[PDB]
Design a protein around this nucleic acid. Structure first.
Lengths: 21, 25, 828, 799
DNA sequence: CAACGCATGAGCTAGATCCG
């Protein structure tokens, strides 16, 4: 759930780099 | 601002993924 | 006699008249009314033959079967009339079976007028001389009786008579008693049986002449079986007919300081008379019941009904009008009504102190308790059960208790209760215990943490205004953009503005209704966001409907939705005061101009409607308007002279914004998957001007200017135009010199004269009058054109002889004077 | 052919165009079809891509954030029906946040079977007000088309197409610039249609090749079998995905693939009741080899093993997965946000839930009306609980009205404690009958289920009060209702009475809302009945109304007002709304009376009906009276200063008119007329106060003119006598006679004579004129005007 | 025993089974 780990809290660029392969 | 939700989420995620492509099962 | 007894009020029974078994002077008012099931055989054995002087009035309103009054009140002598009924002292209205009035012994009704109506069997009304009974005769009202159509043979006995309106009728009350009269040498004291007059103090009958101890109605004051004009110390006047000591006026104050229901009249001592209440600017000292004057605001004093009084609406609040200090508890329950803007501040805007406990139970229409504007203390002598003194439930819209900057509350004892008040925030009931001081005498109060704050915010941030620009009529307002951390949540902004007289306006004041507001609420949609520190993202709004040189108040209020944890956000800017610029004013209204001499005009005008600044001065020009030259061509001797965002719309519009947030929150959740020229005058600060140095009877044109700023290259308005005239001089129309005659032979004569060297306006006609002394006169009108062509007048049709000739020149003002009788004579 | 292509499973297309090439010859997409997230795409290369043979898509179609699609008529020219077995947040077509869409272009779309369409957030889209959606998909209210370029009427919108009249206006409906849609005559509704209006076979949708042929149709309806359309396909075949029929060999071998569970999305398809259904339903088990369904020994439920311990029902995409399962081994939330109405589809898929082993939670749901779609709830077992030890739970449900119909429903919650908060249309009576039939009896909190915030915006009472006596007058109307007493004689603050105007009988019921408004019925408070200590007493309470208008209808109902208490009684009482009409009173004054004169006998007069008629006006009433002229106009000489120039009772009961003609009266005279309006007449005639007009007719021509020879008499003292006749009837009153005499060379010299001199001289005398022959010309002038002259007659003296 | 005579009608004196 991207809208619960990057909207209810801050998320690092190590975390949302997982979304692109 | 580092609080990435709303309409900015689909744009800010594109620039960090500009060539690899998105991922799906 | 007997003893004094208070006033009755009897209805529908007859058993209540037993309480006059011993009354003699019933102070108060006796009114017998509405007795229906009483036959005339019930009124035969009833008599009060010792009732002698009643003070207030009498009233007999629809008794049935009262045959005559001569057996109920056979010894009334004086009625006083301090308190009256429709300003009438004796009211006989709508009885039946009433044959004779028969109150054969009353002598001097002091103040009022008698009103006898519509009692269809009453005569012996025409033989009652009200000239010598009541002193003020012209307001009685005796209509629609039996004696509109005279049928009953009112013959009465041997009894004296007088005249009233030209008719020498006899005077009688009944068929066996006649009206007692006293001869005019001893006017009001009343006569004895043979015609001597009584003492100089008594009213009506006296038993023995020249003894003031034994007459039956004292006129001024009664004192201990004697009769006295002014009661000396140590006595005091009471109800202006009898005199008591200090001990007889003190004890009944304490004996009905407690009310059975009402009241008592709590007696004061003030300048030798026991009065019910002292006048304005005077207050009682409670020690010896003396009445002392005031300094500053005086207490009233307002006690209340049985310890608790409930206000439901304005009509419930009317009993507490002007009440300053309240000795008991109070409860407010307001729901609605009409025009709720300023009325709740009007009825209780001068309240000072409250001493029980205050309940804001079930109140919905209020927004704030700022209408206790002068309240300083809730000390709370009596306590609410639960050891409380301040209680509040069911406050769905209450938002602000009190302003702790411009106001200082205190309290001493008891506890507090704030439950189920959603809009009332939590930090404002944390802001009161520094001012009230319940952190002192420190106590555990009971306020729940979750019961407040719903549909409310208190962690607001502070918006700063960015740029301000004023024109003569418009102001722009752009400020810095506020975003909540989830920028979908901000629905829009809310701006508030109102005119302001000074720099003292508070933030939530005076609106205090259901669907009304003192401010002018205006909306503005939010701007867009582009993830850019510098961009076109500063919000804005243009305000148009302004006035010149006004001073306003403005602030910004956000409006956001709620995440599902009861965690709100928002912001609110400071209260900023903005002031406009100056434009040229408008014209000075309705100038008028009256003259008083031969060379003066005075002016009167008004200051303009919108001054648009401090008007420094005025400016006034006057120019001459010489003469209307087209008036030169009229023969004047022919005709004469030529000259709504409701609450349901708030919820459904906030639901639709939370519906569009929810779908595009779901769409991200499944598509991403992580990896495992003329002269002038200058008048200052005045509204008049006395012009001088003018020509007589020449119409001036006056232009007016109102000019507000002078020194930096002044500007001002369109001129207001008015016209004026000067009152002409009287001497300046007489013909100078003797009028010259020239005698031609063919009986046409030349009468030439010279025009006066300074006329008033124009000389329009000439009246020449030739007459033989002893013969008639024939008038001749000499026109302006004939005199201009001939330089005189050729008078045709003149028989020979001497003639007296009078010359005058009619101008636009009036007549001048005739000349000498112009004698052109030939010897007969 | 019918479906000439290959069946083709669902696809997702992302980041490129290379994955789009595997849709070359697909004809039906079971599964869904998405086109997502294409950024590096110029508009110039979508011109050479086309998918001709795509016909029907079963689940839905989602397009989101593509760049370079100007109009969809390059890609999808021929999709006729999208069917909607599996929806997407209760929408069956969603187009969300494209940047370069100009025209919709889906010009062949006929029937959306199940779902709705949501076209959202496009900064270039035009042609959305020209679609006529109500014929295409079979519901119309569930759509959502906002925030577009067609928020204003600014896209041009030219179209050269029936121009249907479904709404009240004559607007034209077209898809694109050069394609107009097909709505043909409505005899056969969805059975297909040709160009020239001939209706097709019954089992077809969309286009037709030839009419009435089940072999060469294009978009078939119920099932499909070997190029035909069969209503119910015979049992050499079984149904499959409710669009196919397929033989025995197909529904068996899919077991052998995913019995080796390489992915948990596959389903072992097992035959049951002529269907190839994935899981055989509750009360049935599969055998070992032969793959059918047999009746169970005892009960065997389909336990519906819920992942992660929670579920959040949002729409019919999430409430689709609990279809047919019976024992939920977790807990359910219910959170339906916004919504128009969702109680029509929630019953048929999650309404077979028997045992639930967690907690419920009904938070923030707006468009719920009743909790009745849960049908076979028996027991909330409740091995777990919420934070704060709860099992049932509610919040902020702004339209909840009913939990369950308690006459035929039983529910036993074993442990846990209730919770209720902010339900503004739910009474305490429906949750207290809940409290007695549930397994819990006295396990509450203090502060328990909230006693104040429930049911504030809806009034509801149980015991009824009837009326007993109603009396009516023209201004006052009187009420009397039979009494009522709660078990506590002090538990009564009194009553409250309501009365409002209503001109028709369709008045609403009392909402119970307090918003300081005009629909608060102008509440009049009633003092409580004083404690009588007597059964028959003066405590049969009533009231009297005072401020009434006559002849109107009022709506009255009465309600008590008791103190609520901790004990679960004294809900109050409330009567039903009735209607009473008052009688009439004297009407008002007739308004705006004008009198217009046209001739010497006709006078017309009009008015308006009064502002306050107070009843049906029966008739008006007009009286008139002849005023006579002033006697002070009879004895004055009228060529001095001043000359005049003005501008039983006969009645008629005028009925149903607004103007009135009066003919046949005297000329130039003045009449005072008065008119009244009047209500009911024959018993006790009651009319209003009058209204007065002064009227004057128009003059006549030949009244004051005199005919006949005037006669001149000669006296010796040269005072010449003249005789004529006064006119026998003038127009009002003859006021002066004007005699003039004339010679040759001079002008005419005239002479006054009035009525006194005419009477005392018997004609007119002439004093002192020159001898000869003078012509005489005589006029008469009245107060109306003048007359003509006479023949100029010669009177002559010789000297 | 079921409208009206032993009043008027929201103008300091009561309030519409308010009194027989």
């Amino acid at each position: 759930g991207i809208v619960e780990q990057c909207c209810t809290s801050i998320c690092s660029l190590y975390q949302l780099e997982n979304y692109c392969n | 601002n580092q609080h990435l939700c709303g309409s900015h989420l689909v744009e800010a995620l594109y620039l960090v993924c500009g060539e690899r492509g998105f991922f799906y099962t | 006699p007997g003893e004094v007894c208070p006033g009755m009020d009897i209805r529908n029974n007859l058993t209540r008249l037993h309480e006059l078994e011993n009354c003699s002077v019933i102070e108060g008012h006796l009114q017998i009314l509405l007795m229906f099931k009483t036959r005339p055989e019930d009124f035969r054995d009833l008599s009060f033959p010792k009732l002698i002087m009643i003070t207030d009035y009498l009233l007999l309103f629809r008794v049935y079967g009262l045959e005559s009054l001569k057996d109920l009140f056979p010894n009334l002598t004086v009625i006083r009339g301090s308190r009256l009924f429709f300003n009438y002292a004796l009211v006989i209205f709508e009885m039946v079976h009433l044959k004779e009035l028969g109150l054969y012994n009353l002598m001097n009704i002091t103040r009022g007028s008698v009103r006898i109506e519509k009692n269809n069997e009453l005569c012996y009304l025409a033989t009652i001389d009200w000239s010598r009974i009541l002193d003020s005769v012209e307001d009685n009202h005796i209509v629609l009786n039996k004696d509109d159509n005279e049928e009953c043979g009112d013959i009465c006995p041997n009894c004296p008579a007088t005249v009233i309106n030209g008719q020498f009728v006899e005077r009688c009350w009944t068929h066996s008693h006649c009206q007692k009269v006293c001869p005019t040498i001893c006017k009001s004291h009343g006569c004895t049986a043979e015609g001597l007059c009584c003492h100089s103090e008594c009213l009506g009958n006296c038993s023995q002449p020249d003894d003031p101890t034994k007459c039956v109605a004292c006129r001024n004051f009664y004192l201990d079986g004697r009769c006295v004009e002014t009661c000396p110390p140590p006595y005091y006047h009471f109800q202006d007919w009898r005199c008591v000591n200090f001990s007889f006026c003190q004890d009944l104050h304490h004996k009905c300081k407690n009310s059975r229901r009402q009241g008592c009249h709590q007696y004061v001592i003030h300048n030798n008379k026991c009065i019910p209440e002292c006048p304005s600017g005077y207050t009682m000292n409670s020690s010896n019941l003396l009445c002392t004057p005031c300094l500053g605001p005086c207490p009233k004093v307002c006690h209340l009904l049985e310890g608790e009084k409930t206000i439901d609406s304005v009509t419930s609040a009317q009993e507490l009008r002007g009440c300053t200090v309240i000795n008991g508890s109070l409860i407010i329950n307001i729901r609605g009504g009409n025009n709720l803007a300023a009325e709740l501040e009007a009825n209780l805007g001068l309240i000072e102190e409250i001493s029980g406990y205050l309940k804001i139970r079930r109140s919905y229409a209020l927004v704030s308790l700022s209408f206790f504007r002068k309240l300083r203390l809730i000390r709370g002598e009596t306590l609410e059960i639960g050891n409380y003194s301040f209680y509040a439930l069911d406050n769905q819209n209450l938002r602000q208790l009190w302003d702790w900057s411009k106001h200082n509350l205190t309290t001493t004892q008891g506890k507090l209760f704030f439950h189920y008040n959603p809009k009332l925030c939590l930090s404002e009931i944390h802001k009161m215990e520094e001012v009230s001081g319940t952190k002192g005498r420190q106590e555990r109060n009971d306020i729940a943490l979750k019961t407040n704050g719903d549909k409310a915010s208190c962690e607001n941030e502070l918006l700063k205004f960015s740029y301000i620009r004023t024109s003569f009529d418009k102001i722009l307002l752009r400020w810095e953009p506020y975003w909540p951390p989830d920028f979908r949540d901000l629905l829009g902004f809310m701006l508030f503005y109102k005119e302001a007289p000074y720099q003292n306006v508070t933030e939530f004041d005076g609106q205090d209704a259901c669907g009304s507001n003192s401010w002018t609420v205006v909306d503005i949609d939010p701007p867009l966001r582009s993830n850019d520190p510098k961009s076109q993202n500063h919000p804005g709004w243009l305000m148009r409907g302004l006035k010149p040189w006004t001073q306003y108040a403005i602030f910004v209020k956000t409006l956001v939705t709620f995440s599902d944890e009861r965690r709100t956000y928002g912001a609110k800017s400071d209260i900023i005061y903005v002031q406009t610029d100056a434009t040229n004013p408008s014209v000075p209204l309705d100038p008028i101009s009256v003259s008083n001499s031969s060379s003066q005009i005075i002016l009167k005008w008004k200051p303009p409607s919108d001054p648009n600044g401090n008007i420094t001065h005025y400016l006034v020009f006057w120019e001459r308007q010489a003469e209307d030259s087209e008036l030169f061509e009229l023969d004047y001797c022919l005709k004469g002279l030529k000259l709504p965002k409701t609450d349901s719309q708030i919820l459904k519009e906030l639901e639709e914004s939370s519906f569009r947030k929810t779908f595009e929150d779901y769409l991200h959740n499944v598509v991403f998957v992580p990896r495992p020229h003329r002269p002038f005058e200058k008048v200052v600060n005045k509204e008049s001007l006395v012009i001088s140095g003018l020509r007589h009877f020449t119409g001036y044109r006056i232009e007016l200017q109102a000019c507000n700023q002078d020194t930096p290259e002044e500007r001002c308005s369109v001129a207001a135009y008015v016209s004026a005239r000067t009152m002409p001089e009287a001497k300046a129309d007489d013909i100078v010199g003797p009028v010259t005659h020239e005698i031609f032979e063919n009986n046409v004569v030349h009468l030439m004269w010279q025009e006066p060297k300074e006329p008033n306006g124009l000389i329009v006609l000439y009246e020449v009058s030739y007459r033989r002394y002893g013969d008639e006169e024939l008038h001749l009108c000499v026109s302006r054109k004939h005199f201009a062509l001939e330089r005189g007048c050729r008078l045709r049709g003149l028989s020979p002889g001497n003639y007296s000739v009078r010359i005058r020149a009619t101008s636009l003002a009036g007549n001048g004077s005739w000349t000498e009788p112009t004698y052109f004579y030939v010897t007969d």
